Ligand SMILES: O=C(N/N=C/c1cc(Br)c(O)c(Br)c1O)c1cccnc1
Ligand SMILES: O=C(N/N=C/c1cc(Br)c(O)c(Br)c1O)c1cccnc1
Ligand SMILES: [Cl-]
């Protein structure tokens with residue numbers, strides 16, 4: 078499939094609250110690209126300390142959201158929607174580079190992730206793209222992932 | 229429009245009970261349109277329900293009441309952070325609420341409330357909660373503002 | 376078939392969990408008819424951080440939620456008796472809420488007692504009505520219709 | 528007064544969520560004894576891990592709620608209900624002795640703290656008593672605290 | 679039986695979970711005799727939100743709780759070694775606490791070290807005593823008796 | 831003027847609070863040059879409930895965040911010294927992040943030590959780089975360019 082919801086996401090990613098930062102997958106093309114998003118609301122614990130009186134979604138959390146989206150792309154590209162194989166694999170990031178923050182993300186924003194496969198070889202996948210809010214580029218980054226066997 | 233920081237200056241509700249993220253339309257003594265983003269990154273989803281995230285219906289109603297409260301605060305004293313800060317809001321009655329579609333993470337929960345009747349601190353509103361243009365809930369409620 | 380259940384029994388029947396399991400103990404239960412339960416209210420609850428600062432007030436919507444869960448427990452055990460194995464894959468949806476009226480603010484230190492009576496039930500759809508009480512007085516009235524469903 | 532509610536407790540004790548363990552004061556005789564309580568509900572964070580499937584209010588937290596009542600007694604005995612002076616004081620607990628746990632406390636219980644002044648000399652206060660659920664003693668302990676100036 | 683266990687091993691032995699599992703690593707362990715472990719203290723802990731605002735202090739009573747869990751880890755590995763299957767069926771029960779002294783306040787940035795020795799033990803009943811240390815100084819002392827039991 | 835600071839001081843300088851204040855103590859500080867600081871890692875942190883169940887690992891992006899806050903403290907104190915009053919009218923933001931590499935997983939029990947060096951500064955624009963260490967071993971490295979902005 079090309080569109081996935083939280084329930085499908087929960088079966089692929091090992092991340093859970095309060096570290097699962099992807100709510101829905103709206104577009105996915107194997108070995109090419111993924112478009113996913115996370116809704117930003119004031120009702121998140123993170124906003125108690127970032128910052129009091131001034132809610133701003135952490136930039137590092139935006140990058141984390143892009144990573145999870147990218148790992149979802151890499152994983153589903155190879156094995157598709159397979160919850161089983163998913164429990165036997167782990168996708169952790171080795172590097173991150175070219176990260177730029179252009180606009181602050183706040184409650185009410187739909188943080189949309191746009192990642193594409195720059196290149197991949199074996200279990201090493203390199204993705205890149207931007208985070209967008211209402212069509213505008215809020216952030217950008219490149220990440221290298223390593224897919225390994227859990228345990 | 230009114231963003232989260234403005235809402236914070238009028239409504240007394242704080243985390244984890246501030247369920248309105250933005251005000252898109254406001255017409256004193258008439259209606260108000262606002263919304264709250266729904267994300268998995270919310271603590272309530274740990275218990276409602278595990279392995280099956282569904283935004284609580286009562287919280288949908290709470291969001292509508294808060295939206296109505298904002299309409300009440302501003303229709304009464306305009307945008308006045310000073311008066312606001314001494315008040316709190318109390319739910320008085322809730323009636324005729326119907327839930328049609330479950331709200332889950334990824335949804336933009338939009339509130340549409342019109343004033344049905346008001347007097348002093350006591351306000352009665354009614355409207356709907358919508359997701360992508362569809363009515364996911366309807367409700368009527370009466371709230372009271374106080375010191 | 377029992378009439379008194381504790382938190383351990385409530386956990387095996389209701390799907391709700393922290394921070395949305397708002398029933399602490401069942402004090403009386405008559406199958407297909409009524410139930411009496413309660414939830415203790417303490418400052419040591421996260422909802423109080425924002426409702427409101429310096430003025431802790433148990434939300435009215437959460438009182439109604441606590442009443443619905445009471446009805447849910449009643450609905451399930453009246454249906455399959457006390458069977459956690461059947462219960463563990465069931466969820467509960469709110470369908471409607473009517474005639475709610477709040478009379479007295481519930482605060483930390485209150486023992487919120489739920490009194491629910493079955494008004495009408497058909498299969499998975501149960502319509503209960505009753506009150507929430509603190510120290511023998513009505514703090515809230517409510518009528519609600521919920522549906523029990525298998526996790527699909 | 529003799530009955531202080533959560534709002535009065537908030538103005539005297541510095542403790543806040545999730546460490547304010549006294550919900551209401553029912554009895555208070557200056558320089559002698561205090562009776563208060565904290566409700567025990569499942570809707571508390573500590574139950575997430577103490578213990579999963581077996582909700583049991585931690586024994587050490589019963590003692591804390593007992594110490595907190597003592598602190599309230601001591602403070603009110605010295606200056607009465609004075610929130611302004613309250614902000615300038617510290618009740619540092621020095622010791623805890625002879626603690627016995629007889630019955631487990633669980634969601635649905637009304638934990639009643641019963642403390643009395645065993646000895647008061649200068650800035651040092653020694654209180655002792657029991658914790659009770661429905662008339663039955665579930666715990667007992669002795670505590671010594673020092674009154675001082677915050678900073 | 680190892681002598682140094684990490685969080686992953688502790689999770690498999692003790693029944694405690696967040697936010698009540700107050701032992702991060704086991705450094706030294708000698709069956710039926712003594713144990714050395716520690717819990718890292720960081721500002722990023724919910725408990726500091728209220729104890730107290732603008733001046734984080736790790737609650738003395740939690741320092742004692744931490745000492746108990748270390749003793750509980752000793753007690754169990756002593757009677758059953760590293761055995762998660764049997765451990766999963768139990769909980770630790772506090773029976774008594776004595777001679778606890780709080781000498782030095784514990785703050786974020788501190789590595790809270792637990793030092794306990796078996797004063798007495800019979801079956802599931804264990805009596806340990808010792809100190810809590812930060813950078814070699816004693817910040818707290820205590821004696822306690824716990825009991826391991828079936829979650830029946 | 832000082833090279834050592836504890837959470838009390840860190841709170842007066844950084845606007846970050848729970849659950850995003852990720853620096854517990856500063857052990858070495860040198861105006862316009864470098865800073866050495868750390869954050870203790872403990873299982874008792876909310877982040878571990880979801881990252882990941884049964885396998886607690888401190889998020890790599892949070893390590894970077896910790897390095898950034900450290901750098902930010904460095905930048906500010908380098909320009910105004912320990913001045914709480916002015917600190918509360920300013921805020922350091924991340925403009926860019928580069929050359930980030932994760933070498934070793936960070937887990938409960940670890941002392942995450944931040945090592946930041948000032949690569950270039952000119953006014954409110956600061957560029958730092960360095961590593962995060964555990965037991966003297968590099969667990970991560972990164973470069974950041976920040977901006978000391980007006981909070982209002
Ligand atoms: O119960 C009390 N405990 N206070 C202890 C306490 C200990 C530390 Br050392 C501290 O930093 C702060 Br502030 C306290 O309030 C209390 C403190 C002041 C006035 N009335 C009651
Ligand atoms: O292994 C890493 N990430 N996550 C690992 C991981 C996650 C889950 Br869940 C799991 O079951 C296993 Br075994 C893992 O290794 C990693 C690798 C290098 C640096 N930091 C983190
Ligand atoms: Cl940021």
Ligand SMILES: [Cl-]
Nearest residue numbers: 284285468469
């Ligand atoms: Cl619902």
Ligand SMILES: [Cl-]
Nearest residue numbers: 318319434435
């Ligand atoms: Cl209310």
Ligand SMILES: [Cl-]
Nearest residue numbers: 585586771772
């Ligand atoms: Cl205990």
Ligand SMILES: [Cl-]
Nearest residue numbers: 736737738739
């Ligand atoms: Cl303490």
Ligand SMILES: [Cl-]
Nearest residue numbers: 888889890891
């Ligand atoms: Cl990571």
